[PDB]
């Protein structure tokens, strides 16, 4: 038993973390095979950060201008390209520690592990979620740019996120590994609307199943509800609307506990309308939405 | 900005995770140099788990009975010894991936990262704290025995915890790497008193400093307090008594924010006497005590 905000082991990812220096700026790069991926804002200076002409800024750059360092050994840059908002630097050596990897674009509400890095050195790892508004609530400081988010299935690392920017609101915005930002965000030091963020309902329901599995049952009740009635309650409390696909994904947890998904919806409806009344669920005084149904299954079954 | 329950990168630790099989039982081992450390309850069977005679059970065992597996390759056991509640199996090969390591016994209130493993395979990593009552609130399933807790300074892994047991209350008990349990716990399937657990006050104060550093200031007030007055409040709310040593350790965070430790104590006194009033601090509706002053400094400064 026990329920923690568990991240994937970062080992396979530490072996890809490099330091990228361009001009006066240093950020993190992801060395996979003979390519180093990093945020394109490495070619920028403070003056041009308000609205940079990335194509023009990259033109004044040659392979020898980009300095890629892997721990201590210098990598030789033989090619440079800009793919959306990332630079792909072809290096003459393939990373001996490259794991089996995929570049995947996650959906909002999905979770992943983040390995925060500074100067190519990892400092920590935390599990987080792609918010419905495409922001992430991470922990990032200056120099954390280039830190990646990922998921791990058996031996394959699916890279899903690269950190680029911190919004004035303190939340974080970044891209997939092909350079496409999640959300409407652009790599300019300009004020940007993060958007209205909602609560990932299916994740809160999955965490309620995780609570029952781990002994917390006080929130269970003699009531049930329909998808329609629950969705009216969810709309009032800024929760993502529940669909039959969400109910289907909660099938495994519903079968393990023997609690129908609409009976768990009725418990969540009561928790929303009445609050926690000073109590806790899994050590928390608020409803948690950063555990997908898959995360709860993995943690309560012990998939390695 | 941002404040997460960040764990150390698990890379250096994954390279030491082995699988130990003895008889019908399988648990995790820590392969450092030519020794594999694991919980001694690997030599037990269900019948003798109520009160095992470990000395007698180990006598019926020879080096060839212990099966140590590192990923896929089998290790050759040339020596076996029992040190308190851990077995030290001398293997003929030194772990090529052994990091610079220390075996340290942490104090209650200290934090560490845990790499949960099953069959020698890591599954996740989470940051947690040694509770004042010497239990840990981890996430462990059957087969998680042998999973270690650690801290990392530069390149040195300080191993501080080895998981042995889950108490009937769902909390976890384990040992240091010399086989000494933290707390009064023994490796027997017997009901054991976990003890009264208190809230690590200096950690809650450190997290309040982390809240101010990251924009959350609603809890700050026009009041101050003495060590004595604050300690009366802490006693009523089952918080660890604050000492001048705790105040001294909060010196760096007090200097960064410019908020005197006794003014932050007065804010905590109000939060305890009045609750959060439905609000949150760093995304939480309760007072957090699993971030030491060092953790807050590391996370808000970016030590790699
Ligand atoms: C300067 O202080 C910080 C603190 C925390 C930080 C956390 N994440 C990122 C940082 N910097 C940037 O976002 C730099 C930047 C600016 C505009 C557009 C783009 Cl793509 C990048 C951070 C800086
Ligand atoms: C059998 O199910 C579980 C579930 C979660 C579990 C989480 N941690 C540990 C487990 N097992 C034990 O503690 C085995 C045991 C028993 C008595 C004394 C000692 Cl030293 C060891 C777990 C078992």
Swiss-Prot record, chains A, B:
<feature type="cross-link" description="Glycyl lysine isopeptide (Lys-Gly) (interchain with G-Cter in ubiquitin)">
    <location>
        <position position="90"/>
    </location>
</feature>
<feature type="topological domain" description="Cytoplasmic">
    <location>
        <begin position="1"/>
        <end position="304"/>
    </location>
</feature>
<comment type="subunit">
    <text>3CL-PRO exists as monomer and homodimer. Only the homodimer shows catalytic activity. Interacts with host FBXO22; this interaction promotes the proteasomal degradation of nsp5.</text>
</comment>
<feature type="active site" description="Nucleophile; for 3CL-PRO activity">
    <location>
        <position position="145"/>
    </location>
</feature>
<feature type="domain" description="Peptidase C30">
    <location>
        <begin position="1"/>
        <end position="304"/>
    </location>
</feature>
<feature type="active site" description="For 3CL-PRO activity">
    <location>
        <position position="41"/>
    </location>
</feature>
<feature type="cross-link" description="Glycyl lysine isopeptide (Lys-Gly) (interchain with G-Cter in ubiquitin)">
    <location>
        <position position="5"/>
    </location>
</feature>
<comment type="function">
    <text>Cleaves the C-terminus of replicase polyprotein at 11 sites. Recognizes substrates containing the core sequence [ILMVF]-Q-|-[SGACN]. Cleaves and inactivates human TRMT1, preventing tRNA guanine(26)-dimethylation of tRNAs. May cleave human NLRP1 in lung epithelial cells, thereby activating the NLRP1 inflammasome pathway. May cleave human GSDMD, triggering alternative GSDME-mediated epithelial cell death upon activation of the NLRP1 inflammasome, which may enhance the release interleukins 1B, 6, 16 and 18. Also able to bind an ADP-ribose-1''-phosphate (ADRP).</text>
</comment>
<protein>
    <recommendedName>
        <fullName>3C-like proteinase nsp5</fullName>
    </recommendedName>
</protein>
């Amino acid at each position: 038993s026990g329920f923690r905000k568990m991240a994937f082991p970062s080992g396979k990812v530490e072996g890809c973390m490099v330091q990228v220096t361009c001009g006066t700026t240093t950020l993190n790069g992801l060395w996979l095979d003979d390519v180093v991926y990093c945020p394109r804002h490495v070619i920028c200076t403070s003056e041009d950060m308000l609205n940079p002409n990335y194509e023009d800024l990259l033109i004044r750059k040659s392979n020898h201008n980009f300095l890629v360092q892997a721990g201590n050994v210098q990598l030789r840059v033989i090619g440079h390209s800009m793919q959306n908002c990332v630079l792909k630097l072809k290096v003459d050596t393939a990373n001996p520690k490259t794991p089996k990897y995929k570049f995947v674009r996650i959906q909002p509400g999905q979770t992943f592990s983040v390995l925060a890095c500074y100067n190519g050195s990892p400092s920590g790892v935390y599990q987080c979620a792609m918010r419905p508004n495409f922001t992430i609530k991470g922990s990032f400081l200056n120099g954390s740019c280039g830190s990646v988010g990922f998921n791990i299935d058996y031996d394959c690392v699916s890279f899903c996120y690269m950190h680029h920017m911190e919004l004035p609101t303190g939340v974080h915005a970044g891209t997939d590994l092909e350079g496409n930002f999640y959300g409407p965000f652009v790599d300019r030091q300009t004020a940007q609307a993060a958007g209205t963020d909602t609560t990932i309902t299916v994740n809160v329901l999955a965490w309620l199943y995780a609570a029952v599995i781990n002994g917390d049952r006080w929130f269970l009740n003699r009531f049930t509800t329909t998808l329609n009635d629950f969705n009216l309650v969810a709309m009032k409390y800024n929760y993502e609307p529940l669909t039959q696909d969400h109910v289907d994904i909660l099938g495994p947890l519903s079968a393990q506990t023997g609690i129908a998904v609409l009976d768990m919806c009725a418990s969540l409806k009561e928790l929303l309308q009445n609050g926690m009344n000073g109590r806790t669920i899994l050590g928390s005084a608020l409803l948690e939405d950063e555990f997908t149904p898959f995360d709860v299954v993995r943690q309560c079954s012990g998939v390695t």
